[PDB]
Amino acid sequence: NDLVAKLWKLCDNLRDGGVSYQNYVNELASLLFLKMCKETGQEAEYLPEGYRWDDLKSRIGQEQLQFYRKMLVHLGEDDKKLVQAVFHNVSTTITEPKQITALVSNMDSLDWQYFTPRPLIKTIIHLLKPQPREVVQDPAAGTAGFLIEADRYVKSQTNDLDDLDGDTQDFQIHRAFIGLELVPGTRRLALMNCLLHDIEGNLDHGGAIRLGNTLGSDGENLPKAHIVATNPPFGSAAGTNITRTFVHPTSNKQLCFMQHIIETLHPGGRAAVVVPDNVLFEGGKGTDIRRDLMDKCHLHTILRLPTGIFYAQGVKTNVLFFTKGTVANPNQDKNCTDDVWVYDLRTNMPSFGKRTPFTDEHLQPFERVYGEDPHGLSPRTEGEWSFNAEETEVADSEENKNTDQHLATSRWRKFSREWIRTAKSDSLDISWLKDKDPEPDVLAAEAMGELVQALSELDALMRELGASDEADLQRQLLEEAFGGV
Numbered sequence: 001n002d003l004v005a006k007l008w009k010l011c012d013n014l015r016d017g018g019v020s021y022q023n024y025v026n027e028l029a030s031l032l033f034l035k036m037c038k039e040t041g042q043e044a045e046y047l048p049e050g051y052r053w054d055d056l057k058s059r060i061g062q063e064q065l066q067f068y069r070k071m072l073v074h075l076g077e078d079d080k081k082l083v084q085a086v087f088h089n090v091s092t093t094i095t096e097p098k099q100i101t102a103l104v105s106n107m108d109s110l111d112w113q114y115f116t117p118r119p120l121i122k123t124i125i126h127l128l129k130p131q132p133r134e135v136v137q138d139p140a141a142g143t144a145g146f147l148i149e150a151d152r153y154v155k156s157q158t159n160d161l162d163d164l165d166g167d168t169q170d171f172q173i174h175r176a177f178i179g180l181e182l183v184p185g186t187r188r189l190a191l192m193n194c195l196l197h198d199i200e201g202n203l204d205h206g207g208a209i210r211l212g213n214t215l216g217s218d219g220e221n222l223p224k225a226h227i228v229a230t231n232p233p234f235g236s237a238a239g240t241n242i243t244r245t246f247v248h249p250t251s252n253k254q255l256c257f258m259q260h261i262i263e264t265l266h267p268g269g270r271a272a273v274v275v276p277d278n279v280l281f282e283g284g285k286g287t288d289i290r291r292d293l294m295d296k297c298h299l300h301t302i303l304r305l306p307t308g309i310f311y312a313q314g315v316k317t318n319v320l321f322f323t324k325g326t327v328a329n330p331n332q333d334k335n336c337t338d339d340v341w342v343y344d345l346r347t348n349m350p351s352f353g354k355r356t357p358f359t360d361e362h363l364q365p366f367e368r369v370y371g372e373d374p375h376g377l378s379p380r381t382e383g384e385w386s387f388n389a390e391e392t393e394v395a396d397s398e399e400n401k402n403t404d405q406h407l408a409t410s411r412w413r414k415f416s417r418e419w420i421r422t423a424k425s426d427s428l429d430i431s432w433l434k435d436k437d438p439e440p441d442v443l444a445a446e447a448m449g450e451l452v453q454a455l456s457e458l459d460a461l462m463r464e465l466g467a468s469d470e471a472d473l474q475r476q477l478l479e480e481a482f483g484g485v
Contacts, residue, residue, distance in 0.1 A: 003451070004454045004457050004458050006110065007451075007455065007458050010028060010103060010106055010107055013099050013100075014028075014094070017094045017100060018093060018094055018095035019094055020093065021465065022462060024459075024462060025455055025458060025459040026090070027093065027094065028455065031104060032107065032451055033086065034052065034053045036448050036451070037053065038052060039440065039444040039447070040440060040444040041441055041444070042441055047083065051071045054282060054283035055067070055283065055284040056104060056284070057104050057251065057284065058251060058252055058284030058285040058286050059250070059251065060242065060250055060251040061101060061249060064100055064101055064104070064251070065094060065097045068092060068094075069091070069092065072090055075087035076088045076090055101251055108236075112443065112447040112450075113233075113234065113312055114142035114143060114186060115311040116145055116274065116310075117309045119362070120274070120363070121146055121149045123360065123363045123366075124146070125149045125150050125152075125229060127272065127370055127374065128229055128270060128271075128374055129153070129374040130150045130153060131154070131157075132161075132168055132171070133168060133172075133176075134176070135175065135176060135178065136150045136176060136225065136227045136229065137178050137222070137223075138178070138228070139214040139219070139228070139232060139257055139260055139264075140180070140181070140233060140257065141180055141187070141190050141209045142231070143186060144179055144193045144208065146231070147177040147178075147179055148194065150227070151172070151177060151197060151199055173198065173200050174201055174202060175201075177199055177201065178201065178202075178209075178210070178222065178225070179208055179209035179210065180209070180214050180218060180219070181209050181210075181212075182211075183238065187211045194207060195207065210222070213240055213241070214232075214260055215241070215256050215257075216241065216242075216243050217243070219260055220244060220263075224264050224265065224269075225264050225269060226268075226269050226270070227269065227270055227271065228261050228264065228269070228272075229271065229273075230261070230271075230274070231273075231274035232257040232274070233254075235253075236253060244256075246259040246260075248285050248288045248292060249285070250285040250286070252278070252285070254275060258275070258289060259289060261273060262293060262324070265297075265324035267331045268323065268324060268325060269323065269324035270322070270323045270324070270375060271322060271324075272320070273320050274318070274319050275317065275318055276317055276318075277318065279428075280302075280318065280427065280428040280429040281427050281428070287427070290426055293337075294336065294337035294417065294426075295335065295336060295337075296333060296334075297322045297336055297337065298322055298323040298325065299320060299428075300321060300322060300323070300339070300375075300377075301320075301322075301341045301343070301370065302319070302341070302343070302430070303319040303343050304316075304318050304343065304346045305317045305318055306345055306349040306358065306362075307346065308353055308358075309352050316346070320428075321376055322337075323336075323376075327375050335417075337417050338417050339414050339417070340414065340417070340430075341412070341413070341414045341415075342413055342414075342415065342430050343370075343412050344411045344412075344431070344433055345366055347392060347431070347433040347434070347435045348388060348389070349387055350387070362387075365384060365386040365411075366384075369412050380414070382414055383406075383407070383412060384410055384411050385411065386411060387411070389411045390409050392433050392435075393433070393436065394409055394433060394434065395432055395433055395434040397432060398423040399415070399423075399432035408432065
């Protein structure tokens with residue numbers, strides 16, 4: 001039915017990927033199984049480390065097809081005969097690298113928004129403190145919200161540019177701010193926004209916001225920047241093909257933006273990037289890119305945002321604050337990150353909505369402890385108990401290990417690089433507070449039952465698709481009977 005039709009659409013990738021109608025189900029079953037094991041929440045018990053859904057899903061292109069082949073072989077040969085019995089003599093018939101990438105991501109988002117809270121924008125620009133002569137970039141301009149605010153901040157510190165010499169004024173008007181938007185419709189609105197804000201940008205490109213793909217040619221043709229404040233798209237984003245090579249090729253749109261942001265920043269540059277929880281915990285290439293970030297950049301602060309502050313809803317978001325290299329050594333290539341400060345402004349927070357609005361008041365505590373230095377070098381000391389932090393349930397995890405009662409309830413805590421490396425296995429999904437009081441492995445299990453049911457039926461349509469010119473004209477003979485009404 002609905003599930004079978006949904007599985008069918010995916011076979012379109014297999015069809016155009018080199019796969020025959022006879023192996024559709026086989027191809028799908030494999031991927032679905034790996035995907036389900038993850039959804040179960042205990043893939044650690046079924047699949048071997050290094051060969052799980054994230055390891056395949058995060059990769060892209062040929063690098064992905066070859067990994068898939070290597071993974072099919074590794075699974076079909078081992079003593080863990082349990083899983084082995086499912087991948088024994090199993091091999092994919094996919095040849096088109098663009099097709100597998102399209103398939104894995106397609107079902108990854110299978111089932112069983114350019115809005116940013118104003119107070120968040122204000123806060124982000126306030127902590128970045130953009131100065132004149134600094135080029136502020138926005139890879140995902142949208143309606144130019146961050147740029148307009150960055151410009152507003154600069155004007156509020158220079159009497160609307162009047163404290164600066166004409167030449168610097170021209171810089172602020174034509175070169176200080178740059179954006180890039182994929183959707184022409186949105187870019188138009190963004191263009192009108194800057195224009196009425198006296199932000200002319202470069203006439204060669206239409207103005208401050210350029211039209212194009214950050215993950216494409218336009219992305220690398222973009223000029224470097226001193227500052228980057230952006231809220232890239234969530235999910236698998238819109239029609240944005242990753243036709244650009246990165247230090248670590250990925251199928252994760254968000255992790256691609258991160259790689260771009262790390263690249264355009266001048267040495268000593270600084271950025272604030274709004275990201276989803278996935279970016280912090282995703283494995284596979286996700287771990288490589290996160291290690292790359294903490295190598296090439298000095299990630300110093302992580303703000304875990306509440307829920308329901310975005311027009312979306314069930315999206316967990318954060319804000320990473322970091323510097324390209326280090327203030328002392330703007331060109332450092334490695335070990336830039338040492339101590340990472342995290343501020344939990346999510347767990348045990350007032351359910352935000354039109355009733356409970358998210359205001360600047362909710363961000364003042366965090367901005368206080370943060371410091372006045374835009375590079376997060378102002379003196380800091382763990383200890384912040386706002387929004388009833390003391391009445392929040394403390395979680396029992398590595399984060400709170402050997403931690404005293406008072407600190408384990410603080411919304412402001414620091415973690416070392418070695419700790420993140422060891423305990424967290426290089427994951428930035430750091431949390432040490434439990435929120436107040438179905439089931440994954442249970443939902444996944446029942447779900448799998450149905451997929452299996454669907455998969456069988458779907459196979460029949462093939463197994464029983466008696467190849468001949470009979471079904472060709474017999475099927476259209478029914479169409480020869482009109483349709484509808």
